[PDB]
Each structure stands twice: as structure tokens, then as C-alpha cells.
Ligand binder design. Sequence first.
Ligand SMILES: Cc1cc2nc3c(=O)[nH]c(=O)nc-3n(C[C@H](O)[C@H](O)[C@H](O)COP(=O)(O)O)c2cc1C
Ligand SMILES: Cc1cc2nc3c(=O)[nH]c(=O)nc-3n(C[C@H](O)[C@H](O)[C@H](O)COP(=O)(O)O)c2cc1C
Lengths: 370, 375
Amino acid sequence: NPLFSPYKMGKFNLSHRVVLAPMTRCRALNNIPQAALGEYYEQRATAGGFLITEGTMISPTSAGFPHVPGIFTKEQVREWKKIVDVVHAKGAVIFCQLWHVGRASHEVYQPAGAAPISSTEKPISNRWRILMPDGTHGIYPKPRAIGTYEISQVVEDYRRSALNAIEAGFDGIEIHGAHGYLIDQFLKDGINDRTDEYGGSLANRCKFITQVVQAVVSAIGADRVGVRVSPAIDHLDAMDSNPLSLGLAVVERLNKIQLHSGSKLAYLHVTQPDYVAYGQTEAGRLGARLMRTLRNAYQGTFICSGGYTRELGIEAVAQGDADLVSYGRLFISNPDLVMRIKLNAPLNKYNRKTFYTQDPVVGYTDYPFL
Amino acid sequence: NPLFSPYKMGKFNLSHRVVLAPMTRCRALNNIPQAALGEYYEQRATAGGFLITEGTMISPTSAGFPHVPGIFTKEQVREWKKIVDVVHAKGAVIFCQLWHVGRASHEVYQPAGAAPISSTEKPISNRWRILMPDGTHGIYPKPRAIGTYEISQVVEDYRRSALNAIEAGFDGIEIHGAHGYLIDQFLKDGINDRTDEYGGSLANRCKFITQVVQAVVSAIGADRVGVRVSPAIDHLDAMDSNPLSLGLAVVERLNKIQLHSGSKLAYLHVTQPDYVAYGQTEAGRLGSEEEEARLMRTLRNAYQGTFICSGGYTRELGIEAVAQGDADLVSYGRLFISNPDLVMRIKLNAPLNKYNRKTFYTQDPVVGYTDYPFL
Ligand SMILES: Cc1cc2nc3c(=O)[nH]c(=O)nc-3n(C[C@H](O)[C@H](O)[C@H](O)COP(=O)(O)O)c2cc1C
Ligand SMILES: Cc1cc2nc3c(=O)[nH]c(=O)nc-3n(C[C@H](O)[C@H](O)[C@H](O)COP(=O)(O)O)c2cc1C
């Protein structure tokens, strides 16, 4: 099983290639990591395994979900430390994902009810609804287009949050630049309609993710920085006319950051849509090797994500399409997913109803082990 | 095994509940049924089993795949007859699926290179491809929105083809009203942007499928007509803002057609969604497998008659669906491609041949068509 052959991720020696994908679960009451998060990550931690945390706030304006953790206050860093300590006691490596939702927020989630910030003034369309603090779903409001001068202020929030993460004991950080959130709102030409130096051409649209990665790379070192992109995922109206060229342009910038710093990033993390069920239709399979194309052009560690199974993950590693395989949904309901992939044992099903609830046990830590 | 308890599908008494799902295979060279189809359907026919044919053209404008069979010419009728006879010789029941692709076509498939017809002028998005006659995967073009008289012309094509089907010996026909093809392009508010009496509200959007079903029911009788739909589907941009209400509106129409005709349709056939949610919140999308099951059972409980489910089913999922009352029959597609004796394999709980997607749509009369081995 090539999923359990050791792999050196920069300076971290991993014993296997099964990775916990970042997953918002909304158990961090009041934006403060709670003891429940420790038991949740401790359950899934393994000796020499790689874990990525749920998206974590970098500032008071970056949230678009209820009760998601932040890492922009020393109070939050102190709570994260207790969680990271428990995870390191099991021998796992843990990165914290730095998450800013941009226009994918609501006044109820913003201080003083301010409008969310984004690259554009265009709101997410009515085809998408935001989970509200009362369990209902509401409308995405019109965001405020941040001025050219303000982009460096947001970059500074990433930089400070990476430093707070190191202060909490995290091994590294992952930049959340996928799924139509703030960074993807600058990448995709279906959203970025800016006239300034951050909009228009492909090179300009990659300016934002570049300065963000450069800022955290300089602060804590490249080998502690991972980057997650989703060029071909249309979530929250975040479509690009040419996902291939966008992906390659990002890879080009990432290779350049590594060449300038003289160090390789922790990894590149690319996620794709799950077309598992398109085989039962007449035309679902007619006609995109983007994953392999980006893997071929990138210099360093590649984590593939999106609809991967035990058999698909094995094939991906044995084929060389990726070095590590991250699992989301399966990890929600299978705390010992690593061992289950080892033994090829049956997997538990997940319950969508408790993805985003606040119970510290129900649907969170009560999925059974083998 | 509840799958092998008999079932009375109207006037047809079936011996088991394993159904051959309709599957385009592209072996009907020049749109004429070929001897290969006879051997293909013969291999899968069982005594008292139900078969549904590949989607079959109702008119020269109805195709969006290469070498798909027609049933709108008398030559096609004569060739189908030979195939139905071999199936009937094995004691099987066989329906012919009537299929119009509408905007899911290309100029290379249309008479005189004309534009495909549809409810709208909007083309299928760049996320989808069409199979071209040379095996390449191409881009769907802009269709032509058709008017009221032309719509009635299409209904007449369905009606004439229904009559040809029974003249060829078929036990009945299935209306293909799923997967974003012509009927679904009228049903789904994600496709139908019309402002006339065929677009807008749910009532207007269900007008076309209602007229098609009524025409064929009046022509050959209700108990020889089945209807297939897919209210929650990504295929070919066939999204709807409220798949549940759309599905119930259709069921209401079918129930009323049955009451007015004093007879019941052969069945309602509903396909599972071709997608699985990932925690997202998109209008018109089912958020979980549990909501998916509730959708299907709600349509089943609403329809006055036989219910066939399809889409990713296995032996275990098919037993459960029948045991739990979720469906009366279960149709299998890909597993039937690679397992000509799938019925016996389900019965014996035997291993199943893998299928080769390569050869689903090639034109070879044997390779990947009739060369899958028996037990
Ligand atoms: C409930 C839930 C929460 C998620 N939260 C995040 C997140 O905070 N950050 C992120 O980058 N991806 C997030 N994801 C996406 C996962 O990483 C996703 O499941 C993965 O990209 C696809 O892998 P899978 O097929 O194994 O589920 C989330 C997914 C789910 C279902
Ligand atoms: C190759 C192929 C061709 C198909 N052709 C048709 C068709 O012509 N008409 C139709 O209504 N469905 C068609 N379908 C959908 C199937 O009838 C059925 O809904 C699907 O195969 C069920 O899923 P399963 O293969 O997992 O059993 C086709 C499916 C496949 C895979």
C-alpha cells in the first residue's frame, strides 16, 4: 500500500500519506477554540500523520460561519496551544488553515454590522445562501470593494495570524485560497472586475495570493507554509473562463517564491469537484486533466483532494499524481480513517445535519472507532 | 429475495423486479436497428423480465448521439420487429424508449445542418460535451426556440412513434422526460426561460410533458406507456429551483391523466441525482443522501401506480428499495452492460463483470457489446 510509505514533507517526517483535510465544524464557541476541538483532532491524530485544521479567522472581519475559531488574539492562541499540545502528544503534525471569507459573509458576522470586504462590489447571487446563527439560511449582502491601499492591511492580518499560529505551537499554516472566498475572489475573472493593479490580466489577478504567500513565507519560513487552490471549483459564483491558465499562473508564482526565498513551500494543495455520480448519465463522462497538469509544473509536494477514496488515493500516489491525499467527509465519520484505510475496513457514513452544529459530542466526537 | 417476487405491471405479469435500464449504445448504424441489437437484448432477456430499449428517435431532429435507432420510419419498424421477436421468444417484456434530445444535439445530426430545436435559445454550457460522429467530444451549439404549432408537431411525432412501436411488437413505450433532454428543457426553470404559455410558472412548464403523455396514452392505451423523469439532476444544466415541487406537479398530471382515461400507466420511472452534496448551500440542490431518499419516496407515495427507481443501484440497494417499499422495480444500467445474465447473478449473489466505459458508445457489433461473458 503506497499510502503507508514514509514521506518527507520538507522538515516533517510523515509515516503515511493520508491527510486530514480542513473542515469547518462550528464547535469553536464564540470564535474561541474549545476543549471539544482537542478531542476531535486527538481522535484523528496518528503518529507521523498530517492534520489540517478547520479554517481559522485572521481578523474580526474574516468570518462567514457561526462559532468558527480565530487566531488573531492572544486569547485564541492560548486556547489553540492546549489543542496543539494534545495533538503533538499523539505524534501528529498539524497545520492551521488561515481563512478569510471575503464577500461570503453577512452583517450578523461582521463587527458593527459592516459590509463584508471583497475584491469587487458584486454580491454572491441568490443561487447561494449563507447559514445564519439561528440555523436558517439568508442572503449574501453587497460587499465593499477594498481600495488598493487596503490590500496590504489584509496581507498583514495573514502575517500576524501565521506568527500567532507558530506562537501556539502549530507546525505550520495553510493559506485558504479556494472555494470562492477572499483570495479566490481575486483570482477568478468571473469575480475580479477591478481596474487597478489587482484586476484585469491574469498576472494582476494573481497579485493578491502572491503577496499573501510571500508575506507568510518571510514571517515563518517557506517549509511551514502550504497553499490550497481550487481553480476548477465553481462555489459561490467563483468561476474562471480558463481554469487551466489560472492554475498554471498560480503554480508559476509559487515556484518563483520558492526560487527567491531559496526554500520549498510545505506543499501545494489542490482540491477538485466530486463527479463520482456522473457515470450514470448519458453525457456525464464525455470530455480535464488539470490536477496532473498542475502537478507536473509545480516543484515540491503536491496534495490532491476532492472525492478521493482508498482505491483512488492509492492509485493517485502509486501513479505519481500526488504525494499526499487529503480526505474530508470520510474523516468526519471515521475518526480512525487512517487505520481503516490500512486494513481496508468498512467506513462509517456521515450525517450532513451535524456538520455545522454546536454540539461538542453529537455528530462531532461520537462517530465510532473500529 | 424480494427482488424475485412476482409483480403485476398492469397487464404484464413480471417474474422478478430486475429491469434493464434504457442505455444508448450507438450500434444502430444509420439509425436502423441492426442484428447486433437483437443478440444484445436477447442475451439480457429473461422469462418474465422487463427490458427497456436504448433511447429511440421519434423524428429526424431527435438525435444527439451517433447511430442511435429510430422508430419513425417503416423500415425501422420492420427491423425492430425482428429484435422484439427474439426478445419475446425468451418470454421477456420490452418497452421502447422514445427519445428527443432537443438542444442537446449538433448541426451534424440535424437535417440540412439546421439548428437543434428546444424550448429556449440558450445553449448548454461549456461544462458539457456532445459525442460527435467521429468519436470526438464537441461543444453544443445554440438551439432554436420553437413555437406552439411546432410543439404540437413534436407531440405528433411522439404519437406516431408510439404507434410504430406497437406495430413492431413492442409491449409498450417509455417517454424519456429526464436528463435535460427535450421534455426536461421545458420542465426545468433552469432551462425554460419562455414567457408564453409553456414557460414561467410550474403549471406552464408541465404543459409539454402533459401533452406528450396524453397523446401517446390516447394512441396506444395507458397501460402501455411509462414515463421517466429526473427532477434533481445536474446533467446538461437541467437544474430546477424546487425539484420536489416540480416532481409533485408532474405526478399530479400523470394521476389526472390516469383518472381521466380510466386506466393506469405502465409505471413512473425516476432517476437518482447524478451528484452528492459536500456541505454546500445551492438553491435547487439536495443537501444530503437522506434528503435524496425523502425526495424519491415522496414522489413514489404521491403517484398512483408502479414506481421504478434507477441510478447507481446494486444488489443490496435494490433489495432494500423493494423491501422497504421505496420502489416496485429497480432498473440497472452499467451492471447490465457488462453482465448479460445480471438477473441470475443477482439471484445467485454471484460476482459481477466490470464494465469498460471505452466501449459504451463505439459502433462495434461485438466488442464491448455482446462479448461480456456469462456465468
Ligand atoms: C463540513 C465541511 C467543512 C469544510 N470546511 C473547509 C474549510 O474550512 N476549509 C477548506 O479549505 N475546505 C473545507 N471543506 C472542504 C473539504 O476540504 C473537502 O471535503 C475536500 O476538499 C473534498 O474532499 P472529500 O471528497 O474527501 O470530502 C469542508 C468540507 C465540508 C464537508
Ligand atoms: C452508457 C449509458 C447510456 C445511457 N442511455 C440512456 C438513455 O438512452 N435513456 C435514458 O433514459 N437513460 C440512459 N442512461 C441512464 C441509465 O438508463 C440509468 O438511469 C443509469 O445507468 C442507472 O445507473 P447505473 O448504471 O448505476 O445502474 C444511460 C446510462 C449509461 C451509463
